[PDB]
Amino acid sequence: MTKQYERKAKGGNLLSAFELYQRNSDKAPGLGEMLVGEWFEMCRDYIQDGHVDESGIFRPDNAFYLRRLTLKDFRRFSLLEIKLEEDLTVIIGNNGKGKTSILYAIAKTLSWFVANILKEGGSGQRLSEMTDIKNDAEDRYSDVSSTFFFGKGLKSVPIRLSRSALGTAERRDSEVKPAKDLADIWRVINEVNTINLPTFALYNVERSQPFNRNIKDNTGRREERFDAYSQTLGGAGRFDHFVEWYIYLHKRTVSDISSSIKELEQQVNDLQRTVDGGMVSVKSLLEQMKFKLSEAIERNDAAVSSRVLTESVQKSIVEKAICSVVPSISNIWVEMITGSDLVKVTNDGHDVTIDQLSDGQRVFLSLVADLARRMVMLNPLLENPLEGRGIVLIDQIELHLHPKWQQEVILNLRSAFPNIQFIITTHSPIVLSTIEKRCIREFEPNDDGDQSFLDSPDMQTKGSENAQILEQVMNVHSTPPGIAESHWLGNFELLLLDNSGELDNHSQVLYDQIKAHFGIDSIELKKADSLIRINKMKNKLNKIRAEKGK
Amino acid sequence: IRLSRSALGTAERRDSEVKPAKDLADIWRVINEVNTINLPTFALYNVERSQPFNRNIKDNTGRREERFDAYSQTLGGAGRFDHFVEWYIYLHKRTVSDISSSIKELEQQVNDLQRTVDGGMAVSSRVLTESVQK
Amino acid sequence: SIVEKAICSVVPSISNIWVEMITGSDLVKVTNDGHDVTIDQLSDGQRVFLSLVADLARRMVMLNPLLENPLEGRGIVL
Q: Do C22 and B105 touch (CB under 8 A)?
A: yes
Neighboring chain A residues of B47 at a CB cutoff of 8 Å: 208, 359, 400
Mutate to test the interface with A, among B8, B46, B48 (most CBs of A within 10 A): B48
Q: Closest chain B residue to C25 measured between Cα atoms?
A: B59
Counting as contact any 3 or more CB pairs under 8 A, the partners of C are: B
Q: Closest chain B residue to A358 measured between Cα atoms?
A: B47
Neighboring chain C residues of B105 at a CB cutoff of 8 Å: 22-23
Q: Do A205 and B47 touch (CB under 8 A)?
A: no
Q: Closest chain B residue to C31 measured between Cα atoms?
A: B114
3-class secondary structure, C52: helix
Q: Which of B58, B62, B89 is closest, CB to CB, to C23?
A: B62
Neighboring chain C residues of B90 at a CB cutoff of 8 Å: 24-25
Round to whole Å and give the CA distance between C59 and C54: 9
Contact yes or no for A110/A144 (Cβ under 8 A): no
Q: Which of C20, C22, C25 is closest, CB to CB, to B61?
A: C25
Residue A459's Cα: distance from chain center in Å? 26
Neighboring chain B residues of C28 at a CB cutoff of 8 Å: none
What interhelical angle do A177-192 and A14-25 show, nearest 10? 60
How far is the CA of A214 from the CAs of A209, A211, A218, in angstroms?
15, 9, 12
3-class secondary structure, C15: strand
Q: In the structure, do chain C and chain B come into contact, i.e. share 3 or more CB pairs under 8 Å?
A: yes
Q: Closest chain B residue to A207 measured between Cα atoms?
A: B51
Round to whole Å and give the CA distance between A109 and A124: 8
Report the amino acid identity of residue A427: H
Round to whole Å and give the CA distance between A429 and A432: 5
Which chain C residues touch B if contact means CB-CB below 8 Å?
A: 18, 20-25
Round to whole Å and give the CA distance between A236 and A209: 8
Round to whole Å and give the CA distance between A404 and A420: 24
How far is the CA of B74 from the CAs of B42, B46, B69, B86, in angstroms?
7, 11, 9, 18
Instruction: Please list the helix, strand and coil fractions of chain B in percent, rounded to the nearest 5, in that order.
Output: 35, 0, 65
Round to whole Å and give the CA distance between A389 and A338: 41
Alpha carbon dihedral A344, A346, A348, A351, in 10-degree steps, equals 60
Q: What is the resolution of this structure in A?
A: 2.8
Q: Which of B90, B99, B112 is closest, CB to CB, to C24?
A: B90
Q: Do C22 and B62 touch (CB under 8 A)?
A: no
Q: Which residues pair with A455 in a beta bridge?
A: A442
Neighboring chain B residues of A206 at a CB cutoff of 8 Å: 51
Q: Closest chain B residue to C16 measured between Cα atoms?
A: B114
Q: Closest chain A residue to B51 measured between Cα atoms?
A: A206
Strand spans (E) along A98-240: 141-150, 157-164, 199-203
**Pairing of the two strands A50-52 and A199-203:** unpaired
Neighboring chain A residues of B8 at a CB cutoff of 8 Å: none
Round to whole Å and give the CA distance between A166 and A140: 9
Minimal Cα–Cα distance from B70 to chain C, Å? 20
Contact yes or no for A436/A89 (Cβ under 8 A): no
Contact yes or no for A426/A393 (Cβ under 8 A): no
Q: Do A359 and B47 touch (CB under 8 A)?
A: yes
Mutate to test the interface with B, among A208, A337, A340, A362 (most CBs of B within 10 A): A208
Neighboring chain B residues of C24 at a CB cutoff of 8 Å: 61-62, 89-94
Neighboring chain C residues of B62 at a CB cutoff of 8 Å: 23-25
3-class secondary structure, A119: coil
Residue A135's Cα: distance from chain center in Å? 32
Q: In the structure, do chain B and chain A come into contact, i.e. share 3 or more CB pairs under 8 Å?
A: yes
Minimal Cα–Cα distance from A449 to chain B, Å? 22
User: Which residues, in sequence order, are CB contacts of C56 under 8 Å at separation 6+?
Assistant: C77
Round to whole Å and give the CA distance between A165 and A139: 9
Round to whole Å and give the CA distance between A162 and A172: 6
Q: How was this structure determined?
A: cryo-EM
Mutate to test the interface with C, among B86, B109, B116, B130 (most CBs of C within 10 A): B109
